[PDB]
Amino acid sequence: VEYAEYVGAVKTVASALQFGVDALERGLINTVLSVKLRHAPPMFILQTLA
Amino acid sequence: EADNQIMGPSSYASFVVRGENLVTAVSYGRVMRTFEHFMARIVDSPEKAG
């Protein structure tokens, strides 16, 4: 019964760790999308300036 | 005295939540004593006059 408690606790901690690196990876995509949108002028200016 | 000592047990008769009880421990919180006795009663020959 203590072993069944222990494997559940290590599953929770491993879930939190894998959640942490997964949330960090999703944040990397979010930062990439934000920095590409920051250097993005709209369509109706670069349709003409190009 | 007709006797000077009585032949009694030496250790506690152990009982821990083993494998087949543990599923009911985690899923229900309902552990029974001697799950093997219940499985020998109401699964293998429930016709057995107790």
Swiss-Prot record, chain B:
Subcellular location: Virion; Host nucleus
Function: Self-assembles to form an icosahedral capsid with a T=16 symmetry, about 200 nm in diameter, and consisting of 150 hexons and 12 pentons (total of 162 capsomers). Hexons form the edges and faces of the capsid and are each composed of six MCP molecules. In contrast, one penton is found at each of the 12 vertices. Eleven of the pentons are MCP pentamers, while the last vertex is occupied by the portal complex.
Similarity comment text for this entry: Belongs to the herpesviridae major capsid protein family.
Assembly, per entry: Homomultimer. Makes the hexons and eleven out of twelve pentons. Interacts with triplex proteins 1/TRX1 and 2/TRX2; adjacent capsomers are linked together in groups of three by triplexes, heterotrimeric complexes composed of one molecule of TRX1 and two molecules of TRX2. Interacts with scaffold protein; this interaction allows efficient MCP transport to the host nucleus. Interacts with capsid vertex component 2/CVC2. Interacts with the small capsomere-interacting protein/SCP.
Record-given protein name: Major capsid protein
Organism: Epstein-Barr virus (strain B95-8)
Lineage: Viruses, Duplodnaviria, Heunggongvirae, Peploviricota, Herviviricetes
Gene: MCP
